[PDB]
């Protein structure tokens, strides 16, 4: 937990379903404005959202649902490929999910009433994380509970498999990089994979365990953020095989670490979900204290706006938006 500059959601969105997963569009949109998607237990809803931050005609927030799709077993993680289109006569959609079935499923859509599906095979132990590993995404890297990092194609074939020491909790794409991937282990091992040559380049070691959530800096490559134990840690390349900076993130078991998609010094963290009406802690660098605290009755999902310093956290049938600094 963290409590500093606690406030209500700058924007609050009322939905017809509890929020299981929810997150923005990272980059590469066919048109202006942020698409966002939330999947619950049997439905996934994509909706375009406009803020008074961006648009003056849009007052507060104008959220308009593009689609609600009937899916099966509850979606537990969603993979965006930064190649989707919103312009012209055909909006491209190629998005993946991992559900309460341990399996991965790929969905392609065009708004023209064509949507077919590719279910991607699993492995030993549940899919812990999955991200498209191209700057537009065509291939997905997944980490699971077999200490294997398995790269798959759109067809469902093993692009690659890397043998890890412990089951990987998180896999991360480098939008600033090119086939630069991170794989995070519970023991505290961070591995950088050059998927262009399948040669592992650099490693990081965390002194706080277990390690489950991390991220690159969005506006910098030397800065690597993560949450371990109960504190948030930043490593500075190439001078660390140990925490460069480590400051408390959440007294309870902090779960998610995210970096601002327009800031190289502002990041967001979530508390341990639910329970104490979990708080989003928006931190600025060189501040153990969070520069912002927001309250969501359950901690479910954490996203950063494509170019706004806007952080969204889901909760019980609701979405909560907080704006932060550069």
């Amino acid at each position: 937990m963290k409590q500093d500059s606690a406030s209500n959601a700058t924007y609050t969105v009322d939905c017809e379903d509890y929020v299981h997963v929810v997150e923005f569009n990272p980059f590469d949109s066919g048109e202006a404005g942020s698409l966002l998607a939330y999947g619950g237990i049997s439905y996934v809803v994509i909706a375009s959202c406009r803020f008074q931050e961006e648009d003056s005609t849009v007052e507060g927030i104008e959220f308009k649902t593009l689609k609600t799709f009937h899916h099966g077993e509850r979606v537990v993680a969603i993979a965006w490929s930064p190649e989707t289109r919103c312009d012209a006569l055909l909006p491209l959609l190629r998005f993946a999910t991992a559900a309460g079935d341990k399996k991965i499923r790929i969905f392609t859509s065009d708004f023209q009433d064509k949507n077919e599906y590719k279910v991607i095979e699993g492995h030993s132990g549940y899919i812990n994380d999955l991200v498209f590993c191209s700057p537009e995404g065509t291939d997905i890297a997944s980490v699971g509970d077999d200490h294997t990092c398995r790269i798959w194609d759109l067809d469902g074939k093993q692009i690659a498999m890397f043998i890890l020491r412990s089951p990987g909790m998180s896999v991360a794409w480098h939008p600033e990089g090119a086939f630069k991937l991170m794989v995070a282990e519970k023991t505290g091992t961070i591995r950088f994979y050059d998927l262009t040559t399948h040669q592992a380049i650099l490693s990081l070691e965390s002194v706080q365990v277990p390690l489950m959530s991390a991220d690159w800096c969005v506006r910098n490559t030397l800065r690597i953020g993560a949450v371990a134990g109960n504190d948030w840690i930043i490593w500075e390349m190439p001078r660390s095989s140990y925490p460069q900076d480590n400051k408390p993130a959440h007294a309870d078991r902090a779960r998610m670490f995210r970096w601002s998609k327009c800031n190289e010094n502002v990041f967001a963290t979530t508390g341990y979900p639910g329970k104490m009406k979990s708080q989003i802690a928006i931190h600025h660098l060189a501040h153990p204290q969070p520069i912002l605290i927001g309250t969501a009755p359950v901690g479910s999902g954490l996203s950063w706006h494509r170019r706004l310093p806007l952080c969204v956290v889901g909760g019980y049938r609701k979405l909560f938006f907080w704006l932060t600094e550069m």
């Binding site: 592992a200 490693s203 002194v207 365990v209």
Partner: protein, 63 residues
Amino acid sequence: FVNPLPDDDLAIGDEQEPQEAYLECLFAPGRFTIAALQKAIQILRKGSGRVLDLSWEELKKEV
């Protein structure tokens, strides 16, 4: 059957990270002694204070 000393020098190819593998070799069970590890740290640091009496986490962190 008595063990004279642990296995000697190893060569690791470039299909993996040598750092993690050598950490595993250094901390492998039944090999070396902890006092050997502190003495090695002290000598490679060109002389330093005693680094004995370390927990597992702090010992690996200091290494």
